[PDB]
Amino acid sequence: YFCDQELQHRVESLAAFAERYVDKLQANQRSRYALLMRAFTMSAAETARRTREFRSPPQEQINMLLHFKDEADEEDCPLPEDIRQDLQDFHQDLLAHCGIQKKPQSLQELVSHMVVRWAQEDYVQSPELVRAMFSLLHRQYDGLGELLRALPRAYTISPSSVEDTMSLLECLGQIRSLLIVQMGPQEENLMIQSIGNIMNNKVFYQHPNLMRALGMHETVMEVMVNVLGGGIRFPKMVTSCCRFLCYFCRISRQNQRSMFDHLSYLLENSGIGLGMQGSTPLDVAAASVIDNNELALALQEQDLEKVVSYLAGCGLQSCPMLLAKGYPDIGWNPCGGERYLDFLRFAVFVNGESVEENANVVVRLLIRKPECFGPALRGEGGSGLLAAIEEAIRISEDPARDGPNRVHLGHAIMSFYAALIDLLGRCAPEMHLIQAGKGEALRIRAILRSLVPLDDLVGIISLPLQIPTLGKDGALVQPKMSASFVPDHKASMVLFLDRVYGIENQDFLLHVLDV
Amino acid sequence: TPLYNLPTHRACNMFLESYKAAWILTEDHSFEDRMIDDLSKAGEQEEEEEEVEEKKPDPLHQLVLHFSRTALTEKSKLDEDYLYMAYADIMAKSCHLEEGGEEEVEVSFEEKEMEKQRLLYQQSRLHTRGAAEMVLQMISACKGETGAMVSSTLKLGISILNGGNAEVQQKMLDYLKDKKEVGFFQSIQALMQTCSVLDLNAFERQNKAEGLGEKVMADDEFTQDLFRFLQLLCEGHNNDFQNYLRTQTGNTTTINIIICTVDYLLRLQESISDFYWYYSGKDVIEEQGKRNFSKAMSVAKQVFNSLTEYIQGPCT
Amino acid sequence: GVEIETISPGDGRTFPKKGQTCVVHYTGMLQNGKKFDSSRDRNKPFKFRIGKQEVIKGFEEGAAQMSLGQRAKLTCTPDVAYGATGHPGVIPPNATLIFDVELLNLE
Amino acid sequence: CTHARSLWRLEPLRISWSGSHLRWGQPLRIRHVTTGRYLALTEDQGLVVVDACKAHTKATSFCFRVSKEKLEIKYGESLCFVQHVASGLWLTYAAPDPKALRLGVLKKKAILHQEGHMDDALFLTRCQQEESQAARMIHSTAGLYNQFIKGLDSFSGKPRGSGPPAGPALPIEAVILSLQDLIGYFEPPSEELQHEEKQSKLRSLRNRQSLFQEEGMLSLVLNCIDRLNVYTTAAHFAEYAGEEAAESWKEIVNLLYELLASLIRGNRANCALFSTNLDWVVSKLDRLEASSGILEVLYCVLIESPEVLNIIQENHIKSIISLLD
Amino acid sequence: RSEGEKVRVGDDLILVSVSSERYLHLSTASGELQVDASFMQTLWNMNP
Amino acid sequence: LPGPLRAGYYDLLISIHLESACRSRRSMLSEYIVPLTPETRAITLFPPGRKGGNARRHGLPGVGVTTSLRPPHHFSPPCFVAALPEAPARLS
């Protein structure tokens, strides 16, 4: 306890000196700004000065300013000699306090002689006692290293945010206290309230670095681990954790990287039953991977294999809780695979540009497992996409097959095929690469053309749509949404048409216009 | 962008990070040798002990015995232990000072001999207390799982066995033959199987990501340390240990490290051939390719040296 | 309801009314002579307003019936006490409570 | 591969020089160590394991041929082919069963076919003496306790009266001696031992307990306890099993509970097997005999597994409190 | 058999087209053995 | 009092009056967050010698001013006469 108090005193003194030194360096930089702005006789020298150590990235500026530790860079650093000497004196004082350089004259020496004497007197038979004394001796001998390890946890805040900071700490304390207790209804409600308060706190999204230092994402991850291991027994717990994690991803980019570091677990636990939840670990992974080029490029093919395997399983067997509710069985599960196809679309397409490596891996996995297409586009079934779409139209039309409606299998068929077509469309190679003549790009485009014929695409594009009409007197009759064909499907298919096949002849253009 | 326009607290945090990166980290302080020397001394217990010179173990002996107890404790998987990592680093540095020495310089024969004697003494201060068995127990308990624990254990073993210490080699061989275990060699084989080779897909991804802004050969230090450890085990032309690595008589199952080493070298050769095929078209090799080639060639150099040691001394 | 037995005499004129503060050291015990409450152990007077219904109703009527400086016994039936939904681990599902309370420092 | 079920005993037909080296093509007999049955080929069921009485040289005799051609053996690295004598048939896996594949089971029903398959030569590996001894005690104990259970079921429901049961007498002495030997065999290692040797002995005890658990001695002991617990007292036991058999009832009950506690002690999987046996232990907590034993069994189960504690219910807690009451 | 191992006589090899990335498959649904490059795979015994 | 009973009563007191607060404070001791305050800037690594001329004096541990943010403890006095009433967690 006393050693911990000493460490806390050291880090607080360091923070106070950091405040004072930051104030002095800001004043000096403003003074130098004024001096250089007034004296700009040398154009080239002024330009070079403005480029380096002048209105630059702040971290780069402070890193270059604090470089006077080296003798060569001491002259390069424009900091005043008094400022440099102040920093050197503080560094020397920190070394002296840490002990870097016979009656015990300090706690460090006293504890060191204590541990040595106790070890020498006898043969200690208590493993816990032995571990305690040797850990204490290690802490006494390693003073500067302990402070070095402690610095990442240190953080500095403004005086006006102390109240909200205390409230956030209290909520986090409730969250941590609920960990050791076995999960129940009351504990569940308390975690929901705590997560809600954390999300509503303004400091939470204003200091993502401080949140990451506190490691709250790890704590909510452990809560999610516990609830997922339990089952869903606590679907409110799972949904709240997923929403909090998605918001944490959306806050910033380094948060997204920290969430991406745990990608494998989320995809492994992403299942059909767990994925039918409103907020899922699959959604968390999608948020952690979406709209980040380097994160998409760092994707391992094992995760893609796992999600493709889940898609293949969903396309193989029917939906368990759907047939339990009593909806007619199609022999396969489109709604489960819709989520997987969305995840693959996010993985492949970023910032409106197709990732070549990810697209190639995905298309090779899909052609390797030909059971991911269901009845239509099947190696064995060979069912035309247009025929399948019209069959689903009539299935949605007749309540005998549509009814077990909360879930419409007729609309699920359309959604699954639209997602598949959209994914294959965004997996298409770029036009500049095609013009350059890359063999892999040409092969991928040829494979996509082979899988999806153009005639079937233009046929479904030309398929009719129901138009609202006030057939009843004074009542405006509309098509039943989430149960009938919608223009989003046509949008995805025409995205495929533009990406893969495209428009090349006016004749074809005019035709497509008329159809 | 100016610091004065930047808010005070954010500037303070950035200054904390800058000071951490620039001053505290770069500062160097040596305490391993002093602390090991202080721990080695028994004090007055041996002064008052008359029947036995030292019946009660000295503090360093108690520490290594505690770590050996933790290693021998039946655990399904080895867990992270910062205390063990730090302590192993301390002892490794203390015994590696003399090996590291702590321009066509003509070192005298006497100077070389005293340096070797100092290294032997510093290695004795640890292997006369249980480190030679602690390293084996830790490697067996790793269960062929890569991590900082096995990395620290391998570094400690290399530091102990540096220079081909016949005494420590005999101690490890006697312990292995007495306990008659397969976990040590199973873990060693698993660690070899879980090594790394050059990856062209990773290289292309890294180049593209860096352009639009090393992973193509990681664990290079780990694999070089593993093969250096094997070479030290066979060092000195000890036919007993060489034959033991080939076949482990007495044990129910034997693992052929010699063949395993050869197998790995092969995989590395295939990776280097793939890299050559990739860079054969281009006129000039870029800096990233040069770095990758240097890494792979250094690893291959280690593997060759290990194989030489296995057979150097006539071993039919 | 609540049965009021006098133990020692008090002022007899200054009766508490709605909206005042009463501090009293009390000792709670079960029907079978088992003690469970004592403000003397805590060495602090128990404080309560009259009218906010934070305390059990029988205790409120017993305190309001007595004057300042009077020590009296209160017999509370489970109807006015916790009753069936008693304190888990403290009070059984059906028990009458006996309380010896002395009123001082009315506010 | 670690269970004792995979254990087989190869013994030459020649009684003389039984311990001699196996010769390529020398006729020999294959016997199952645990079940005690001999491998043989029959007309109606193909090849099966049969009793010792049904075992004959016409069916139980096999040979380790060098190769498939119709025109000494190292223990390992052997390409021996198991050919039944007086026949050209060989041991080989049946045609891949799609049903078995669906089941995902590796139960390749072994078939004797004159054509065989490419994967017919098989490796031989000797087990440890500990495993061999454990399998032998499993066989003997299973036989003895099956005999005891049959004896107990013989007189169930029929009053004995004056004349003792006309059936075979119960092997009370053998059962008691076997229980004592098993308790001594499963006794935990002493804590005074060094840490390393103590850990090794704990591992030995754990694997031994696992072997007996997978062979099912725990279920056999539970069945014996269920059979014995029908009679309330020693006099009630004597009213059916005989006065001479009465005196050992309490001792056998206590030994059975102690043996069950020894089996489950220190094995988390064995304790977890009693996840649905919480009623079985709680409803017997109030038994006058072996009350300490059943309490110790419950203590071990609760301190070893968390799930048996998570299932604990209000009636269970009330029964535990009534134990004190 | 594993990638990198030298193939030998009397061994099954999976043949995949370099361009179309399809296996040499023996379709039998038509009633006659037809060799075609499809996404399903079939083993090949490569004998000299 | 016998030693086992003395230890039992001490541990019972610690469990029923300090366990939750001690656990919460121990959990919060891991992180160091400090506000920009005059009390913060008043902290000195080496306190000046009171006598004078004394430098590099190490302050006594646990005596210096600490401005790191630690949430305060919360307790609820025991009460068994109040009427017995989603459900907030009870306090120590």
E12 DSSP β-pair partners: E45
Cα separation, B57 vs B45, in Å, equals 10
Count CA atoms within 13 Å of residue B168 on its CB side: 33
Q: Which two tokens stand for residue D100?
A: 């078995």
Pairwise CB contact (< 8 Å): A156 & F44: no
Cα separation, A471 vs A481, in Å, equals 18
Name chain C's partners: 3 or more CB pairs within 8 A.
F
Q: Which amino acid is at A369?
A: K
How close F9 gets to chain A, by Cα (Å)? Answer: 24
Torsion angles phi and psi, residue D312, rounded to 5: -50, 135
Parallel, antiparallel or unpaired: strands E34-38 and E23-27: antiparallel
Torsion angles phi and psi, residue D54, rounded to 5: -75, -10
| A15 at interface of F, judged by CB pairs closer than 8 A | yes
Q: What is the 3-state secondary structure (H, E, C) of A72-118?
A: HHHHHCCCCHHHHHHHHHHHHHHHHHHCCCCCCCCHHHHHHHHHHHH
F33 DSSP β-pair partners: A155
Parallel, antiparallel or unpaired: strands F32-35 and A154-157: parallel
Q: How far is CA D241 from CA A351, D160, D161, D222, in A?
A: 86, 7, 10, 20
Cα separation, D138 vs A286, in Å, equals 55
Q: Which two tokens stand for residue C54?
A: 């934070």
Cα separation, A173 vs A214, in Å, equals 11
Q: How far is CA A17 from CA A85, B13, B15, in A?
A: 14, 12, 10
Cβ-based neighbour number of residue D86 at 10 Å:
11
Cα separation, A343 vs A329, in Å, equals 25
Task: Find all residues with CB under 8 Å of D71, minimum gap 6, and list them.
Answer: none
Parallel, antiparallel or unpaired: strands C46-49 and C35-38: unpaired
Cα separation, D144 vs D152, in Å, equals 12
Q: Which amino acid is at E17?
A: S
What's the CATH number where C37 sits? 3.10.50.40
Secondary structure (DSSP) of F18-84 = THHHHHHHHHHTT-EEEE--HHHHT--SSPPPSSSS--SPPPPTTTS---S--PPP------SSBPP
Q: Which two tokens stand for residue A329?
A: 């069985």
| C90 at interface of F, judged by CB pairs closer than 8 A | yes
The C-alpha angle with vertex A205 and arms to A204 and A211, in degrees rounded to 5, equals: 50
Q: How far is CA C36 from CA B15, C39, C44, C84, in A?
A: 60, 10, 16, 18
Q: Say if CB A414 and CB A485 are below 8 A apart.
A: yes
Q: Say if CB B229 and CB B151 are below 8 A apart.
A: no
Assess whether C59 carries a catalytic annotation. no
Element (H, E) at A510: helix A506-514
Q: Which residue of C has its CA nearest to F80?
A: C37
Handedness of CA B96, B102, B105, B110 (dihedral sign): negative
**How long is chain E?**
48
Assess whether C99 carries a catalytic annotation. yes
Cα separation, D199 vs B76, in Å, equals 13
Assess whether C26 carries a catalytic annotation. yes
Q: Say if CB D108 and CB D93 are below 8 A apart.
A: yes
Active-site choice (C4, C15, C56, C100) = C56
Among D116, D10, D8, D117, CA closest to D63: D10
**How long is chain C?**
107
Q: Say if CB A241 and CB A224 are below 8 A apart.
A: yes
- Residue A163 region by backbone torsions, left for phi larger than 0, else alpha for psi between -120 and 50, else beta: alpha
Is F15 exposed, middle or buried, given 0-12, 13-18 or 19+ CB atoms closer than 10 A?
exposed
| B72 at interface of D, judged by CB pairs closer than 8 A | yes
C27 DSSP β-pair partners: C38, C100
Count CA atoms within 13 Å of residue A95 on its CB side: 15
Contacts 24+ apart (CB under 8 A), A328-334: A328/A401, A328/A404, A328/A409, A330/A409, A330/A413, A332/A374, A332/A375, A333/A272, A334/A374, A334/A409, A334/A412, A334/A413, A334/A415, A334/A416
Among A53, A60, A10, CA closest to B18: A60
Enclosing domain of residue C16:
1-107
Q: Is B235 known to sit in a ligand binding site? A: yes
Task: Find all residues with CB under 8 Å of D27, minimum gap 6, and list them.
Answer: D12, D13, D57, D61, D62, D63, D85
Distance of CA A193 to the CA centre of its chain: 24
Distance of CA D145 to the CA centre of its chain: 11
Count CA atoms within 13 Å of residue A460 on its CB side: 31
**How long is chain A?**
515
Among A161, A266, A179, CA closest to A215: A179
Q: Which two tokens stand for residue D307?
A: 């799930």
Asked if chain D contacts chain E via 3 or more Cβ pairs within 8 Å, the reply is no
Q: Which two tokens stand for residue A462?
A: 């030309």
Name chain D's partners: 3 or more CB pairs within 8 A.
B
Is B34 exposed, middle or buried, given 0-12, 13-18 or 19+ CB atoms closer than 10 A?
exposed
Task: Find all residues with CB under 8 Å of A276, minimum gap 6, and list them.
Answer: A321, A335, A336
Active-site choice (C37, C46, C50, C100) = C37
- Which residue reads 């025109």 in tokens? D71
Q: Report how many domains make up chain C.
A: 1
What method did the depositors use to determine the structure?
cryo-EM
Task: Find all residues with CB under 8 Å of D320, minimum gap 6, and list them.
Answer: D282, D285
**Chain breaks after residues in chain A, where C lies over 2.5 Å from next N:** 101, 231, 404
Assess whether C82 carries a catalytic annotation. yes
Among D76, D53, D47, D80, CA closest to D65: D80
Pairwise CB contact (< 8 Å): B74 & D195: no
Q: Which amino acid is at A31?
A: S
Among B35, B312, B60, CA closest to B164: B312
Element (H, E) at C23: strand C21-29
Eight-state DSSP code of residue C3: E
Pairwise CB contact (< 8 Å): F82 & C56: yes
Q: How far is CA B233 from CA B228, B310, D47, in A?
A: 9, 9, 53
Task: Find all residues with CB under 8 Å of F31, minimum gap 6, and list them.
Answer: A153, A155, A213, A214
Q: Which residue of A has its CA nearest to F28?
A: A173
Element (H, E) at E25: strand E23-27
Assess whether C91 carries a catalytic annotation. no
Pairwise CB contact (< 8 Å): A447 & E39: no
Task: Find all residues with CB under 8 Å of D166, minimum gap 6, and list them.
Answer: none
Q: How far is CA D52 from CA B284, D49, D111, in A?
A: 81, 9, 21
Distance of CA C46 to the CA centre of its chain: 10
- Which residue reads 């670690």 in tokens? D2
Q: Which two tokens stand for residue D78?
A: 């052997």
Parallel, antiparallel or unpaired: strands E12-13 and E44-45: antiparallel
Pairwise CB contact (< 8 Å): A367 & E39: yes
Is C59 exposed, middle or buried, given 0-12, 13-18 or 19+ CB atoms closer than 10 A?
buried
Asked if chain C contacts chain A via 3 or more Cβ pairs within 8 Å, the reply is no
Q: Say if CB B291 and CB B214 are below 8 A apart.
A: yes
A69 DSSP β-pair partners: none
Task: Find all residues with CB under 8 Å of B3, minimum gap 6, and list them.
Answer: A22, A25, A26, A29, A58, A61, A62, B11
Stated resolution in angstroms: 3.3
The CA-based dihedral angle spanning residues C67, C69, C71, C77, taken in that order and rounded to the nearest 10 degrees: 30
Pairwise CB contact (< 8 Å): F84 & C28: no
Count CA atoms within 13 Å of residue E15 on its CB side: 13
